[PDB]
């Protein structure tokens, strides 16, 4: 069995639009995603998610709601990514570009799936329907899913 590392992912989902961030530099640049990163020692997962949202988007929020969990496995990487997915309760400031991520609003009939992680085509529709989910995705590289599971759950 494999060890897992904790990550967060935050979707700022409003009634007609969603905020995504384009990764600007390094490997993986060019893909839109929610905001997030590794959880740090001592902080709750929710507090790590709030911290990453502020660092990557500039938005400071008091509370998030957990909507899902996705485990990622990559061929050749023994460590799994255990990603805890949150949506914002409300926001009260403007997003800002950080040298590493460019935030952008998308209308909910223009979700940029072709420029997102392939897994998001599966779980983001559940997120839009205000459902909770558990997913697992095994990737060859960045683009190819070899195996995956997705289930709606009542409790994350
Ligand atoms: Na990040």
Distance CA 66, CA 114 (A): 25
Pull the structure tokens for residue 82.
């255990």
How many distinct structural domains can be found in the chain? 1
Identify the domain containing residue 100 by its residue range: 1-156
Judging by beta carbons within 10 Å of its beta carbon (0-12, 13-18, 19+), is residue 57 exposed, middle or buried? buried
CATH at 109: 3.90.79.10
> In sequence order, what are the residues at sequence separation of 6 or more whose Cβ sits closer than 8 angstroms to the Cβ of residue 75?
138, 139, 140, 141, 146
Judging by beta carbons within 10 Å of its beta carbon (0-12, 13-18, 19+), is residue 116 exposed, middle or buried? middle
Experimental method, per PDB record: X-ray
Pull the structure tokens for residue 105.
């609003």
Pull the structure tokens for residue 147.
């195996």
Distance 33 CA to ligand 1 centre (A): 9
Distance 78 CA to ligand 1 centre (A): 20
Judging by beta carbons within 10 Å of its beta carbon (0-12, 13-18, 19+), is residue 37 exposed, middle or buried? middle
Q: What is the resolution of this structure in A?
A: 1.2
């Amino acid at each position: 069995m494999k060890a897992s590392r904790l990550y967060t992912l935050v979707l700022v989902l409003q009634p007609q639009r969603v905020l995504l961030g384009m990764k600007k530099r390094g490997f993986g640049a060019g893909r839109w995603n929610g905001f997030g990163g590794k959880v740090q020692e001592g902080e709750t997962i929710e507090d790590g998610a709030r911290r990453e949202l502020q660092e990557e988007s500039g938005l400071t929020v008091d509370a998030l709601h957990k909507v899902g969990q996705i485990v990622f496995e990559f061929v050749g990487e023994p460590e799994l990514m255990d990603v805890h997915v949150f949506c914002t309760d409300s926001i009260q400031g403007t997003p800002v570009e950080s040298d590493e991520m460019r935030p952008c609003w998308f209308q909910l009939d223009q979700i940029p799936f072709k420029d997102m992680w392939p897994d998001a085509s599966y779980w983001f529709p559940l997120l839009l329907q205000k459902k909770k989910f558990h997913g697992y995705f095994k990737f060859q590289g960045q683009d190819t899913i070899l195996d995956y599971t997705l289930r709606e759950v009542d409790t994350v």
